[PDB]
Design a protein around this ligand. Structure first.
Ligand code: HEM
Ligand code: HEM
Lengths: 141, 143
């Protein structure tokens, strides 16, 4: 989605409040996705996907760190995310539905931990932001 | 639905404030997915997030939507039959594209996460995703 100036500032403030918990929330979002949408597990056949798995916690930190980088580059996400799109679109060929599933589970995780920060307006801006990340990661450009 | 799913859905719903969650769910639908405002023009001014969330008609309708979902929890093995008439209404009279039923369900799940916090565990969410998937499929059935 195309982000407004208000969307960008909303995302920066919300993700800033995530702060040091970013890695923790990324792993929780992954666990939520694997349990609610078990077809997503077929992309991780080499992972231990049980609860508390070291691989899932390490991967949640990677995803969260990538989102933090995307927030810093919210005005030039295609360039900033080119290597990541190369992995997800060219190598892994992730079906775009899966980005909607992870994005939903990220929002649920933020709602469960930061209810006061997760206002309707911020919810709307984060949804647009994650859809824009998802579009880049599913494009070959 | 597993028996575990049915117990989790029934248990959690008994703790939901339906009026609060209903208004918050419909309001968030309209804020987050703004084209859905077109279906509710009779509700008045939906031109900003705070105008939507404080609109008394949005809150009243949201209560009716969640009350319909709460009534369906007594019929979890026959959601198709329970929602057949409402499926016709949303298709033939309201012309709601069925993708929007999935969106409403996902907003409801986020609102439950807001309300229940850590208690809305990954396992509890998975039962509720089955719920909103089944509701959306039942409302789409007559399309
Ligand atoms: C917001 C969306 C996403 C972000 C920011 C993201 C981020 C990342 C990052 C940073 C990596 C590691 C890249 C590297 O080490 O070079 C990665 C790898 C990977 N991603 Fe994603 N990802 C997203 C969505 C998804 C989805 C939806 C799936 C599939 C359901 C997926 C499947 C994978 C897999 C299988 C790997 C390789 C993991 C491994 O072998 O260790 N990603 N992702
Ligand atoms: C879980 C999904 C949904 C449920 C359970 C649900 C349920 C209901 C119910 C119970 C009514 C009242 C019908 C009556 O008065 O006889 C209604 C009406 C209506 N619904 Fe839905 N609905 C859902 C999704 C949606 C969505 C996604 C939209 C549009 C984006 C929508 C648009 C409408 C409209 C416009 C009305 C008429 C409101 C009025 O002017 O009074 N519904 N729905």
């Amino acid at each position: 989605m195309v982000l407004s100036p208000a969307d960008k500032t909303n995302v920066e403030a919300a993700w800033g409040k995530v702060g040091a918990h970013a890695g923790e929330y990324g792993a929780e979002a992954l666990e939520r996705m694997f349990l609610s949408f078990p077809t997503t597990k077929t992309y991780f056949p080499h992972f231990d996907l049980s609860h508390g798995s070291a691989q899932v916690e390490g991967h949640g930190k990677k995803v969260a760190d990538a989102l933090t980088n995307a927030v810093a580059h919210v005005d030039d996400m295609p360039d900033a995310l080119s290597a990541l799109s190369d992995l997800h679109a060219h190598e892994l060929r992730v079906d775009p539905v899966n980005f909607k599933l992870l994005s939903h589970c990220l929002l649920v995780t933020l709602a469960a931990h930061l209810p006061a920060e997760f206002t309707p307006a911020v919810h709307a801006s984060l949804d647009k932001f994650l859809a824009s990340v998802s579009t880049v990661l599913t494009s070959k450009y | 639905f597993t028996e575990e799913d049915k117990a989790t859905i029934t248990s959690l719903w008994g703790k939901v404030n339906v009026e609060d969650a209903g208004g918050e769910t419909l309001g968030r639908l309209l804020v987050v997915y703004p084209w859905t405002q077109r279906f509710f023009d009779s509700f008045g001014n939906l031109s900003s997030a705070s105008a939507i969330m404080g609109n008394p008609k949005v809150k009243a309708h949201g209560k009716k939507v969640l009350t319909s979902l709460g009534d369906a929890i007594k019929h979890l093995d026959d959601l198709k039959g329970t929602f057949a008439q409402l499926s016709e209404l949303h298709c033939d009279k309201l012309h709601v594209d069925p993708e929007n039923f999935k969106l409403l369900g996902n907003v409801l799940v986020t609102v439950l996460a807001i309300h229940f916090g850590k208690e809305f565990t990954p396992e509890v969410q998975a039962s509720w995703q089955k719920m909103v998937t089944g509701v959306a499929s039942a409302l789409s059935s007559r399309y």
